[PDB]
Amino acid sequence: ALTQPPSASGSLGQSITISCTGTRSDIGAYSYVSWYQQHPGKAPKVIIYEVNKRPSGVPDRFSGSKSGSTASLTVSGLQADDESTYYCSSYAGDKNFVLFGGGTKLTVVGQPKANPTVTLFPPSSEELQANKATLVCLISDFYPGAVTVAWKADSSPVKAGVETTTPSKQSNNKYAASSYLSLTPEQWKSHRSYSCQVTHEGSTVEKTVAPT
Amino acid sequence: EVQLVETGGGLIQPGGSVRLSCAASEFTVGSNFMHWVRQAPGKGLEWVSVIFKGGTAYYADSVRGRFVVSRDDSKNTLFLQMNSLRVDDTAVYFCARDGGLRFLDWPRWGMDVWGQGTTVIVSSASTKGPSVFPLAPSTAALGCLVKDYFPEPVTVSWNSGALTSGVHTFPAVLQSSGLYSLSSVVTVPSSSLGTQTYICNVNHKPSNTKVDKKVEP
What we know:
The complex is a heterodimer.
Chain A: E1 7-11, E2 16-21, E3 33-38, E4 45-48, E5 62-67, E6 70-75, E7 84-91, E8 98-100, E9 104-109, E10 117-121, H1 125-129, E11 133-142, E12 148-153, E13 156-158, E14 162-164, E15 168-169, E16 175-183, H2 185-190, E17 194-200, E18 203-209
Chain B: E1 3-7, E2 10-12, E3 18-25, E4 33-39, E5 45-51, E6 57-59, E7 67-72, E8 77-82, E9 91-98, E10 113-114, E11 118-122, E12 131-135, E13 140-149, E14 155-158, E15 167-169, E16 173-174, E17 180-188, E18 198-204, E19 209-215
């Protein structure tokens, strides 16, 4: 089996080295170790093959090595892009088989803080015609990934009907989340307005919609 | 552009079968060592099979005798036939190109071109396709609310994949009922609410449902 640490943390602009421990039957016996970077929801991308060779196009700042039965990936000049899960693999050495490590999720600290963009949609006429109503609060481009979402009906706080997602990383390497307020069409049309309040690092942004 | 495009899959009852397709573009599957790699929900990468240039197929122990990898060179397509499906076959399935060695009929065991992945769910659970509603305001945004579907996943594109700039698809929420909803959005200049019409293409393979919804603010 190939063993990798579940998590690692490096500092922006600096380096991190991730280990991949196999056996003398695989990593110790052959120079067919590969390393893959995977962003959530995306296919893996190869960044090292044959232990220390950079696939075509891959920049110099990715490098690999092995000593004994342990292979290592080093990423220098850490960028926000580099946050992701890294997988090592090795030719099994005994038969045509690829072994994979369990992955290392890499956090890059020291990144600039980013406050969220917030977009609030009222219920569509098509949904109301279906006897339903959903307010949709979309939250994007924030870092680090943790927000609080609160809703108001007119000026009053409301917990009923609120469903809020966990934060998920975007292609821009910032986080996104969503919050949905389910209400009856009567609730929607009889209230002066509804507000979505999004808090991030003590900074709260508010958006408001109204039936009229 | 060099690429691999996967299709097939969906939700299959235990014991059933499904075939995945992996279509190559601008390189030939027969000139390469083509791998299948899978990833179970919340888990890491696991190797499934490889087919050598001569057609010889190799399999991981977990799928031996149940899966068959093959190629149709006339269609420049790699296949994975998955029989006697088990719940633990549930995963995203990737195909990938292994260029092999320069002078020898041997893999290098690293893969540089990958398909986008296709999801196979092995379950006896019932399914429900999404209802899609337009999102319009009332820099700005318009989008599609993809509501009340089960199970995951749904994929969303805009204008059949011709529109990628400013598109943001958000993670799904687990509703109080256990159904899922998500939203996808296009960012536009607030002046450009000048009435361009957009189409979101919602694919829910588990229920074999595809929805094109017109969004016109």
